[PDB]
Design a protein around this nucleic acid. Structure first.
Length: 493
DNA sequence: TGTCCCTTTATCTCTCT
DNA sequence: AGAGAGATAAAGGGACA
């Protein structure tokens, strides 16, 4: 008999128990833990179900699943119940910060290293606790924290980096590797190739940073003489996760895409210059003639879809869904292109296929409004949030559907909608803002933090902003969101 | 196997003007 | 509004005890 059977049966038995109180986990949550944390993590959750949920830690089940669902999940669960009170009371961290550090492979190691190194990194190295938390909150967080402790001085003194830069480099998975590589390669890339430290940090500050830097050192000469790429173009391609893969693929496919399809080098660089750039390039090479065939999509439009993170997914999804979206739901191909041309274009396309009939018939939106909401990053999330919150926002809060659509139709739309639903009553009732003013603040990228900043200034007034009326604060918040409010505080004092 | 660390890709949100 | 950046997450491989 297959050996995994006994372990599988154990998994399934324990999993069934966890559907009961006090966690009541669903099928998804259960598979998620089993998939990454394994059967030991599933058993640890059950074993420590009571100690985690209520007094003293009071963790949500979502927080328990998030800690459990990684390699060493069992170890992280034990460690959190032990160290969460310590880190909150002895270092002044929030439970949310402790859970964030815990929620990665080897979270035990990160937690214990934070407990050990936070004081010396803050006192002897000048870091804030937030920076230590951010360094800790990735796979290998322990290695990154120890490497920041060791290398912060030589990186700032011998190599000219700021602590912000070092923290930025450290704050990715593999952070130790990127730090050690930047130490070695910063003089090489700057002096031999005329890169600024700022360009080097940008290349370093992603997962696999070590790989991208070494690949830039290796390929920059070939790319910038043979192919005729500029150093700036190479830096842009390198400055994303999978940067090594994107750079090697540009070397491969730049002449192929230009000659076989008449794409420009600038168009190829743009496609390469996203997360998954390698996948996007290879997919364009395969699919462009399939998409463009017989006055179909233009190359221009194919390039546009491809020129976002996960562009491969958007391209394949357009190939799948262009006909049904146009036949059944009556969209123009220009509209499908618009929806596809953002990060997560695949998710947005599939969500439009799924929710266009419902938002139209059940909620009285136009296809144009559904398209407008879908046509931003996180379009799927905004569409699902509009479906969920249109009734309470309209019926209980007095907003028109037009206003809801406007709030929804920006990056972060979901966050803006949920924040309006939350804070509209206190902003209007308690502080006298009009609904239209609240809608205006929320109808921008960064809607959520702009609303939260306003709420904070109205609830716990900072004298630095006191000279501004509510109307002036609204104007500032619409103009530049949270950053503008913060920028204004700094100007005052 | 269980755990830790590293890399790549995809998705979501916010900033910067 | 459209170009950068972090943020979060899934998932695979190397390593080793």
């Amino acid at each position: 008999q297959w050996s995994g059977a006994r372990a599988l049966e154990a998994l399934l038995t324990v999993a069934g128990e966890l559907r009961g109180p006090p966690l009541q986990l669903d099928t998804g949550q259960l598979l998620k833990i089993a998939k990454r944390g394994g059967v030991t993590a599933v058993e640890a959750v059950h074993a420590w179900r009571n100690a985690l949920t209520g007094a003293p830690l009071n963790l949500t089940p979502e927080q328990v699943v998030a800690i459990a669902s990684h390699d060493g999940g069992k170890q992280a669960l034990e460690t959190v119940q032990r160290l969460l009170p310590v880190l909150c009371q002895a270092h002044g961290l929030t439970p949310q910060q402790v859970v964030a550090i815990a929620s990665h492979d080897g979270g035990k190691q990160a937690l214990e290293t934070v407990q050990r190194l936070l004081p010396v990194l803050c006192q002897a190295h000048g870091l804030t606790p937030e920076q230590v938390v951010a360094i800790a909150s990735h796979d290998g967080g322990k290695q990154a924290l120890e490497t920041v402790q060791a290398l912060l001085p030589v990186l700032c003194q011998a190599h000219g980096l700021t602590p912000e830069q070092v923290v930025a480099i450290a704050s990715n998975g593999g952070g130790k590797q990127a730090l050690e590589t930047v130490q070695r390669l910063l003089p090489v890339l700057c002096q031999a190739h005329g890169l600024t430290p700022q360009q080097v940090v940008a290349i370093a500050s992603n997962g696999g940073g070590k790989q991208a830097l070494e690949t830039v050192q290796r390929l920059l000469p070939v790319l910038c003489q043979a192919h005729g790429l500029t150093p700036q173009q190479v830096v842009a391609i390198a400055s994303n996760g999978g940067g090594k893969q994107a750079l090697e693929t540009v070397q491969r496919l730049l002449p192929v895409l230009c000659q076989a399809h008449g794409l420009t080098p600038q168009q190829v660089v743009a496609i390469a210059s996203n997360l998954g750039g390698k996948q996007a390039l290879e997919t364009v090479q395969r699919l462009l003639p399939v998409l463009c065939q017989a006055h179909g999509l233009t190359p221009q439009q194919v390039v546009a879809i491809a020129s976002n993170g996960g562009g491969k997914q958007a391209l394949e999804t357009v190939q799948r869904l262009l006909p049904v979206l146009c036949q059944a739901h009556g969209l123009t191909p220009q509209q499908v292109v618009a929806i596809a041309s953002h990060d997560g274009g695949k998710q947005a396309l599939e969500t439009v296929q799924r929710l266009l009939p419902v938002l139209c018939q059940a909620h009285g939106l136009t296809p144009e409004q559904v398209v407008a909401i879908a046509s931003n990053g996180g379009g799927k999330q905004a569409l699902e949030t509009v479906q969920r919150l249109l009734p309470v926002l309209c019926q209980a809060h007095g907003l028109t559907p037009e206003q809801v659509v406007a709030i929804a139709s920006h990056d972060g739309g979901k966050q803006a909608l949920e924040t309006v639903q939350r804070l509209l009553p206190v902003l209007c009732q308690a502080h006298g803002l009009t609904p239209q003013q609240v809608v205006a603040i929320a109808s921008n990228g960064g809607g959520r933090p702009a609303l939260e900043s306003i709420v904070a200034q109205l609830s716990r007034p900072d004298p630095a902003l006191a000279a501004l009326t509510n109307d002036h604060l609204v104007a500032l918040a619409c103009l530049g969101g949270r950053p503008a409010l913060d920028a204004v505080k700094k100007l005052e004092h």
